[PDB]
Design a protein around this ligand. Sequence first.
Ligand SMILES: CC(=O)N[C@@H]1[C@@H](O)[C@H](O[C@@H]2O[C@H](CO)[C@@H](O[C@@H]3O[C@H](CO[C@H]4O[C@H](CO)[C@@H](O)[C@H](O)[C@@H]4O[C@@H]4O[C@H](CO)[C@@H](O)[C@H](O)[C@H]4NC(C)=O)[C@@H](O)[C@H](O[C@H]4O[C@H](CO)[C@@H](O)[C@H](O)[C@@H]4O[C@@H]4O[C@H](CO)[C@@H](O)[C@H](O)[C@H]4NC(C)=O)[C@@H]3O)[C@H](O)[C@H]2NC(C)=O)[C@@H](CO)O[C@H]1NC(=O)C[C@H](N)C(=O)O
Ligand SMILES: [Ca+2]
Ligand SMILES: [Ca+2]
Ligand SMILES: [Mn+2]
Ligand SMILES: [Mn+2]
Lengths: 241, 240
Amino acid sequence: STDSLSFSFINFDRDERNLIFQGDAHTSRNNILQLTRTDSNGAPVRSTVGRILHSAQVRLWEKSTNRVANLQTQFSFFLSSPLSNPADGIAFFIAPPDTTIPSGSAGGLLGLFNPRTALNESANQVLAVEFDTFFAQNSNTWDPNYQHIGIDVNSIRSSKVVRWERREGKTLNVLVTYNPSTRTIDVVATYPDGQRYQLSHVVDLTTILPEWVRVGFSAASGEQFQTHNLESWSFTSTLLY
Amino acid sequence: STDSLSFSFINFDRDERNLIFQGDAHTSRNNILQLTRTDSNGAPVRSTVGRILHSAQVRLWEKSTNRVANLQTQFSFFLSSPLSNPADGIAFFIAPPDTTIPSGSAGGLLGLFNPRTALNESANQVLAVEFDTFFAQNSNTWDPNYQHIGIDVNSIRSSKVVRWERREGKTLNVLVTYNPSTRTIDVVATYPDGQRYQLSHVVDLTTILPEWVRVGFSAASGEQFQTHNLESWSFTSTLL
Ligand SMILES: CC(=O)N[C@@H]1[C@@H](O)[C@H](O[C@@H]2O[C@H](CO)[C@@H](O[C@@H]3O[C@H](CO[C@H]4O[C@H](CO)[C@@H](O)[C@H](O)[C@@H]4O[C@@H]4O[C@H](CO)[C@@H](O)[C@H](O)[C@H]4NC(C)=O)[C@@H](O)[C@H](O[C@H]4O[C@H](CO)[C@@H](O)[C@H](O)[C@@H]4O[C@@H]4O[C@H](CO)[C@@H](O)[C@H](O)[C@H]4NC(C)=O)[C@@H]3O)[C@H](O)[C@H]2NC(C)=O)[C@@H](CO)O[C@H]1NC(=O)C[C@H](N)C(=O)O
Ligand SMILES: [Ca+2]
Ligand SMILES: [Ca+2]
Ligand SMILES: [Mn+2]
Ligand SMILES: [Mn+2]
């Protein structure tokens, strides 16, 4: 009785037919999705980007009946690094279906933006929820001066941020929703001990993205590095109104 | 949580990016999916096959672990025709991801089989649930002598059938499930007045289909014809 699409992964098998793997994204022998490159011992390496998109296209709206999609997605990730200042982060993102890794998008651009246009909203079509671990003010000039979760609308400079603490190796469980009635992106992220982070932003997704999109994850490292380990992912979209 | 995939169409838009259209399959201005060919006034015509598959592949089973999927799908369709003996039928089906319309598959082969291998189980990889309106024993030599619902396992000759009544322009609502614990396909179908049909068959899908499959619908006409109009479709599969 609705138009809808849903999928869930509890781990990531070696030859997954419904995922589009980009750049350095790969799977580990224990079915964890590794977004960024590792060496032969599984250690993270510099200057790497990897992404995945689900192959099923999501319809963001349907005009003739004035419907717009809601969206709900849950995912779990952890990060590992020997460094004091591990980098760069992982993001959930929504983009056109033919989206590809931009040139120059490693480091603090998180695999999402070209350096030429990273701060230029008119040149991009992307909504991302970022988990940003590296904020050095002399390179990541757009960042607040702390680790943070952000909502990114056509730019690596987030519209809203909240202070966040990276915890070496610990799973962060995230819920992201879009409510088309209030035009609100809501983010809730919780560590296993119950420590919670919340962030929201009003953005009408129909004004920034095309009718059909793909959804997925991106991660990068620059001169500093970490593994970006995606453990599980569920997603649902329903046309409403 | 689980490894699962679900989708639902309450009707069909002119633009549906996650469907693979094969042969004569197309959408109507009224957001109905029309499987078989029509003329310029929307009247059905002879000798036509159309199919749709969802673009998302379904993991039916995993060889390394022996995990197997359950499946549930619900759909609704209606048929229309000027003919006293309209033909040939519509089927839900499950097949390998690269499945295409076989040559010679119009008429009573429902877009699913080639004439030389339609009864050779070793040559096919398909599970279908057919809604068969044309049973002439002199051409459809594999059919029971009445309209019927059938469960087809690598053959156009159904493994099980139940008598069924075609109703011009009326919607049949259908549920098809696969239960991997009992290895049973079950089918329940109803018309708007409550008239009910049920059929089941025990078949281990892991014996007839590869690990990754696609799902969708096929329909055909031969010398006799009708439109095959898919109104809605929902699907869910979970790998246990
Ligand atoms: C010389 C000699 O005697 N040779 C013998 C051969 O003639 C025998 O061949 C068989 O003859 C049968 C009788 O004529 C044929 O049955 C008829 O087949 C018609 C065509 O079937 C099509 O269309 C069907 C409907 O859509 C579809 O279900 C079929 O599957 C088939 O479509 C094929 O399918 C193929 C896959 O299998 C596919 O590759 C093809 O692409 C596809 N074709 C197309 C174009 O897409 C069928 O229409 C006939 O049905 C009508 O007639 C029966 C009564 O006979 C009625 O019960 C039906 O309701 C229907 O009636 C019609 O309905 C209309 C609509 O309401 C109405 O307008 C009409 O007025 C009414 N017509 C009538 C007559 O009432 C029917 O089933 C059969 O197809 C032939 N088989 C083959 C393989 O060609 C042959 C085998 O029996 O045997 C020969 N005899 C000998 O060899 C003896 C001796 N050794 C010798 O002489 O040599
Ligand atoms: Ca940063
Ligand atoms: Ca038949
Ligand atoms: Mn940031
Ligand atoms: Mn039959």
